[PDB]
Amino acid sequence: SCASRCKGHCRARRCGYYVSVLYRGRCYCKCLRC
């Protein structure tokens, strides 16, 4: 679960918003509201 791992990374960085998308075997993650 790429998005699940990215979601924990944003929470670990003290963030309330995060984005996650998997396409063509690529992971697009983002963290905001920190």
Side-chain angles (χ1 to χ4, degrees):
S1 307
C2 212
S4 305
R5 189 176 91 268
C6 290
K7 193 227 243 186
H9 202 115
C10 210
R11 225 231 269 99
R13 281 242 297 284
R14 200 175 108 228
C15 300
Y17 221 65
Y18 92 95
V19 187
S20 59
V21 154
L22 217 164
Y23 189 81
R24 207 226 181 242
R26 194 109 103 253
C27 201
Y28 289 84
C29 283
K30 197 119 265 124
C31 190
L32 282 162
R33 290 287 241 241
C34 305

Short mmCIF file of all heavy atoms in Angstrom, two decimals:
data_model
loop_
_atom_site.label_atom_id
_atom_site.label_comp_id
_atom_site.label_asym_id
_atom_site.label_seq_id
_atom_site.Cartn_x
_atom_site.Cartn_y
_atom_site.Cartn_z
N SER A 1 0.86 -1.23 0.00
CA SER A 1 0.00 0.00 0.00
C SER A 1 0.88 1.26 0.00
O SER A 1 1.31 1.73 1.04
CB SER A 1 -0.83 -0.09 1.28
OG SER A 1 -1.50 -1.34 1.33
N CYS A 2 1.15 1.80 -1.16
CA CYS A 2 2.01 3.03 -1.25
C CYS A 2 1.33 4.21 -0.54
O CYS A 2 1.93 4.88 0.27
CB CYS A 2 2.16 3.32 -2.75
SG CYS A 2 3.77 4.08 -3.06
N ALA A 3 0.08 4.46 -0.85
CA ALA A 3 -0.66 5.59 -0.21
C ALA A 3 -0.66 5.43 1.32
O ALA A 3 -0.52 6.40 2.04
CB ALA A 3 -2.09 5.51 -0.76
N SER A 4 -0.82 4.23 1.81
CA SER A 4 -0.83 4.02 3.29
C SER A 4 0.53 4.40 3.88
O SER A 4 0.61 5.02 4.92
CB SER A 4 -1.11 2.53 3.50
OG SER A 4 -2.30 2.17 2.81
N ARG A 5 1.60 4.05 3.21
CA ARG A 5 2.96 4.41 3.72
C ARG A 5 3.14 5.93 3.65
O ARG A 5 3.67 6.55 4.55
CB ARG A 5 3.95 3.69 2.79
CG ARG A 5 5.37 3.82 3.35
CD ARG A 5 6.33 3.02 2.47
NE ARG A 5 6.82 4.00 1.45
CZ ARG A 5 6.19 4.12 0.31
NH1 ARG A 5 6.45 3.29 -0.67
NH2 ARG A 5 5.32 5.07 0.15
N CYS A 6 2.67 6.53 2.58
CA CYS A 6 2.78 8.01 2.44
C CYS A 6 1.90 8.71 3.48
O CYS A 6 2.26 9.74 4.02
CB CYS A 6 2.28 8.32 1.03
SG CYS A 6 3.46 7.69 -0.19
N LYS A 7 0.76 8.14 3.78
CA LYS A 7 -0.15 8.75 4.80
C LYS A 7 0.55 8.78 6.16
O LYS A 7 0.47 9.75 6.89
CB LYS A 7 -1.37 7.83 4.85
CG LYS A 7 -2.51 8.52 5.60
CD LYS A 7 -3.12 7.55 6.61
CE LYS A 7 -4.59 7.30 6.26
NZ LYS A 7 -5.12 6.46 7.37
N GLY A 8 1.25 7.72 6.51
CA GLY A 8 1.97 7.69 7.81
C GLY A 8 3.12 8.70 7.79
O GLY A 8 3.40 9.35 8.78
N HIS A 9 3.78 8.84 6.66
CA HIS A 9 4.91 9.82 6.57
C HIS A 9 4.41 11.25 6.81
O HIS A 9 5.05 12.03 7.49
CB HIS A 9 5.45 9.68 5.14
CG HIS A 9 6.86 10.19 5.08
ND1 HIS A 9 7.93 9.36 4.79
CD2 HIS A 9 7.40 11.44 5.27
CE1 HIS A 9 9.05 10.11 4.82
NE2 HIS A 9 8.78 11.39 5.10
N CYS A 10 3.26 11.59 6.28
CA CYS A 10 2.71 12.96 6.49
C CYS A 10 2.32 13.13 7.97
O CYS A 10 2.60 14.15 8.57
CB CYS A 10 1.47 13.04 5.58
SG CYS A 10 1.21 14.75 5.02
N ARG A 11 1.70 12.13 8.55
CA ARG A 11 1.32 12.23 9.99
C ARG A 11 2.59 12.31 10.85
O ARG A 11 2.66 13.07 11.80
CB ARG A 11 0.55 10.95 10.30
CG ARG A 11 -0.71 11.29 11.10
CD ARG A 11 -0.78 10.41 12.36
NE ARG A 11 -1.54 9.20 11.95
CZ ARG A 11 -0.91 8.10 11.62
NH1 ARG A 11 -0.26 7.44 12.54
NH2 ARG A 11 -0.93 7.67 10.39
N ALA A 12 3.60 11.55 10.49
CA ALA A 12 4.89 11.59 11.25
C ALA A 12 5.52 12.98 11.13
O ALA A 12 6.21 13.44 12.02
CB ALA A 12 5.78 10.53 10.59
N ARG A 13 5.28 13.66 10.03
CA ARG A 13 5.85 15.03 9.84
C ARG A 13 4.90 16.09 10.42
O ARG A 13 5.09 17.27 10.21
CB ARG A 13 5.97 15.19 8.32
CG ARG A 13 7.22 14.47 7.82
CD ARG A 13 8.19 15.48 7.19
NE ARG A 13 7.46 16.04 6.02
CZ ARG A 13 7.34 15.34 4.92
NH1 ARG A 13 6.32 14.53 4.77
NH2 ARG A 13 8.23 15.45 3.97
N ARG A 14 3.88 15.68 11.16
CA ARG A 14 2.91 16.64 11.76
C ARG A 14 2.13 17.37 10.65
O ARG A 14 2.08 18.58 10.60
CB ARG A 14 3.76 17.63 12.58
CG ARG A 14 2.87 18.34 13.61
CD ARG A 14 3.74 19.22 14.51
NE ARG A 14 3.43 20.62 14.10
CZ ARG A 14 4.40 21.47 13.87
NH1 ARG A 14 5.07 21.97 14.87
NH2 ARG A 14 4.69 21.82 12.65
N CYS A 15 1.51 16.62 9.77
CA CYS A 15 0.73 17.25 8.67
C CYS A 15 -0.72 16.76 8.70
O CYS A 15 -1.00 15.63 9.05
CB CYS A 15 1.42 16.79 7.38
SG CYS A 15 3.15 17.35 7.40
N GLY A 16 -1.65 17.62 8.35
CA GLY A 16 -3.09 17.22 8.37
C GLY A 16 -3.58 16.90 6.95
O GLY A 16 -4.70 16.45 6.78
N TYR A 17 -2.79 17.14 5.93
CA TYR A 17 -3.25 16.84 4.55
C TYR A 17 -2.18 16.09 3.77
O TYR A 17 -1.00 16.36 3.89
CB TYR A 17 -3.50 18.21 3.91
CG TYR A 17 -4.76 18.17 3.08
CD1 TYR A 17 -6.00 17.95 3.70
CD2 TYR A 17 -4.69 18.34 1.70
CE1 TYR A 17 -7.17 17.90 2.93
CE2 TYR A 17 -5.86 18.29 0.93
CZ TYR A 17 -7.10 18.07 1.55
OH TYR A 17 -8.25 18.03 0.79
N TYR A 18 -2.57 15.14 2.96
CA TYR A 18 -1.58 14.37 2.15
C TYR A 18 -2.24 13.82 0.88
O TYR A 18 -3.42 13.50 0.86
CB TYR A 18 -1.07 13.24 3.07
CG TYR A 18 -1.89 11.98 2.89
CD1 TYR A 18 -1.45 10.98 2.01
CD2 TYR A 18 -3.09 11.81 3.60
CE1 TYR A 18 -2.20 9.81 1.85
CE2 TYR A 18 -3.84 10.64 3.43
CZ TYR A 18 -3.40 9.64 2.55
OH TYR A 18 -4.14 8.49 2.39
N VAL A 19 -1.48 13.69 -0.18
CA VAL A 19 -2.04 13.15 -1.45
C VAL A 19 -1.30 11.87 -1.84
O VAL A 19 -0.12 11.72 -1.57
CB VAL A 19 -1.81 14.25 -2.50
CG1 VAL A 19 -2.52 13.87 -3.80
CG2 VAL A 19 -2.37 15.58 -1.99
N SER A 20 -1.98 10.94 -2.46
CA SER A 20 -1.31 9.67 -2.86
C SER A 20 -2.00 9.07 -4.10
O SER A 20 -3.20 8.91 -4.13
CB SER A 20 -1.45 8.75 -1.65
OG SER A 20 -2.84 8.57 -1.34
N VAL A 21 -1.23 8.74 -5.11
CA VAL A 21 -1.82 8.16 -6.36
C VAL A 21 -0.83 7.19 -7.01
O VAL A 21 0.32 7.52 -7.22
CB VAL A 21 -2.10 9.37 -7.27
CG1 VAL A 21 -2.08 8.94 -8.74
CG2 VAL A 21 -3.48 9.96 -6.94
N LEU A 22 -1.26 6.00 -7.35
CA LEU A 22 -0.34 5.02 -8.00
C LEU A 22 -0.73 4.86 -9.47
O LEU A 22 -1.86 4.56 -9.80
CB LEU A 22 -0.54 3.71 -7.24
CG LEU A 22 0.80 2.98 -7.11
CD1 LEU A 22 0.69 1.89 -6.04
CD2 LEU A 22 1.16 2.33 -8.46
N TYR A 23 0.20 5.08 -10.37
CA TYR A 23 -0.12 4.96 -11.83
C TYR A 23 1.07 4.40 -12.62
O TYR A 23 2.20 4.81 -12.42
CB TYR A 23 -0.43 6.39 -12.28
CG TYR A 23 -0.99 6.37 -13.68
CD1 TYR A 23 -2.34 6.07 -13.89
CD2 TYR A 23 -0.16 6.66 -14.77
CE1 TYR A 23 -2.86 6.06 -15.19
CE2 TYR A 23 -0.67 6.64 -16.07
CZ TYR A 23 -2.03 6.34 -16.28
OH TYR A 23 -2.54 6.33 -17.56
N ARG A 24 0.82 3.48 -13.52
CA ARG A 24 1.92 2.88 -14.35
C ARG A 24 3.05 2.33 -13.47
O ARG A 24 4.20 2.30 -13.87
CB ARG A 24 2.41 4.03 -15.23
CG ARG A 24 3.01 3.48 -16.53
CD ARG A 24 4.34 4.17 -16.82
NE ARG A 24 4.81 3.58 -18.10
CZ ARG A 24 5.94 2.91 -18.14
NH1 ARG A 24 5.96 1.66 -17.76
NH2 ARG A 24 7.03 3.50 -18.55
N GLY A 25 2.74 1.89 -12.28
CA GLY A 25 3.80 1.34 -11.37
C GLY A 25 4.59 2.49 -10.73
O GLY A 25 5.68 2.30 -10.24
N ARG A 26 4.04 3.68 -10.72
CA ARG A 26 4.74 4.84 -10.11
C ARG A 26 3.92 5.38 -8.94
O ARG A 26 2.70 5.36 -8.97
CB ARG A 26 4.84 5.88 -11.23
CG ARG A 26 5.84 6.98 -10.84
CD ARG A 26 7.12 6.84 -11.68
NE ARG A 26 7.01 7.92 -12.71
CZ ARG A 26 6.75 7.61 -13.96
NH1 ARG A 26 5.51 7.37 -14.31
NH2 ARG A 26 7.71 7.54 -14.83
N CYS A 27 4.56 5.84 -7.90
CA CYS A 27 3.81 6.36 -6.73
C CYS A 27 3.89 7.88 -6.65
O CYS A 27 4.96 8.47 -6.63
CB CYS A 27 4.48 5.72 -5.51
SG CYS A 27 3.33 5.75 -4.11
N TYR A 28 2.75 8.53 -6.61
CA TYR A 28 2.71 10.02 -6.52
C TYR A 28 2.22 10.41 -5.12
O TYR A 28 1.03 10.43 -4.85
CB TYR A 28 1.69 10.45 -7.59
CG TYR A 28 2.27 10.25 -8.97
CD1 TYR A 28 2.20 8.99 -9.59
CD2 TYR A 28 2.88 11.32 -9.63
CE1 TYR A 28 2.74 8.81 -10.87
CE2 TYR A 28 3.42 11.14 -10.91
CZ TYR A 28 3.35 9.89 -11.53
OH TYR A 28 3.87 9.71 -12.79
N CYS A 29 3.13 10.70 -4.23
CA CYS A 29 2.72 11.07 -2.84
C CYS A 29 3.01 12.54 -2.54
O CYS A 29 3.90 13.14 -3.11
CB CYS A 29 3.55 10.16 -1.93
SG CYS A 29 2.85 8.49 -1.94
N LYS A 30 2.26 13.11 -1.62
CA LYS A 30 2.47 14.54 -1.25
C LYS A 30 2.03 14.77 0.21
O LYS A 30 1.17 14.08 0.72
CB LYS A 30 1.59 15.34 -2.21
CG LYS A 30 2.03 16.80 -2.21
CD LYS A 30 2.47 17.21 -3.62
CE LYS A 30 3.99 17.05 -3.74
NZ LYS A 30 4.20 16.14 -4.91
N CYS A 31 2.61 15.75 0.86
CA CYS A 31 2.24 16.05 2.28
C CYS A 31 2.08 17.57 2.44
O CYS A 31 2.93 18.34 2.04
CB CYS A 31 3.43 15.54 3.09
SG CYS A 31 3.05 15.56 4.87
N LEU A 32 0.98 18.00 3.02
CA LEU A 32 0.75 19.47 3.21
C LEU A 32 0.10 19.75 4.57
O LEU A 32 -0.11 18.85 5.36
CB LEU A 32 -0.19 19.88 2.06
CG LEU A 32 0.61 20.01 0.76
CD1 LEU A 32 -0.35 19.98 -0.43
CD2 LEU A 32 1.37 21.34 0.77
N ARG A 33 -0.22 21.00 4.83
CA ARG A 33 -0.86 21.37 6.14
C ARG A 33 0.00 20.87 7.31
O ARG A 33 -0.48 20.17 8.18
CB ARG A 33 -2.24 20.70 6.14
CG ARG A 33 -3.15 21.39 5.11
CD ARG A 33 -3.57 22.77 5.63
NE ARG A 33 -5.05 22.71 5.75
CZ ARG A 33 -5.80 23.52 5.04
NH1 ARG A 33 -6.02 23.28 3.78
NH2 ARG A 33 -6.31 24.58 5.61
N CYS A 34 1.26 21.22 7.32
CA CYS A 34 2.16 20.76 8.42
C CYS A 34 2.42 21.90 9.42
O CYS A 34 2.54 21.61 10.60
CB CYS A 34 3.46 20.35 7.73
SG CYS A 34 3.11 19.13 6.44
#
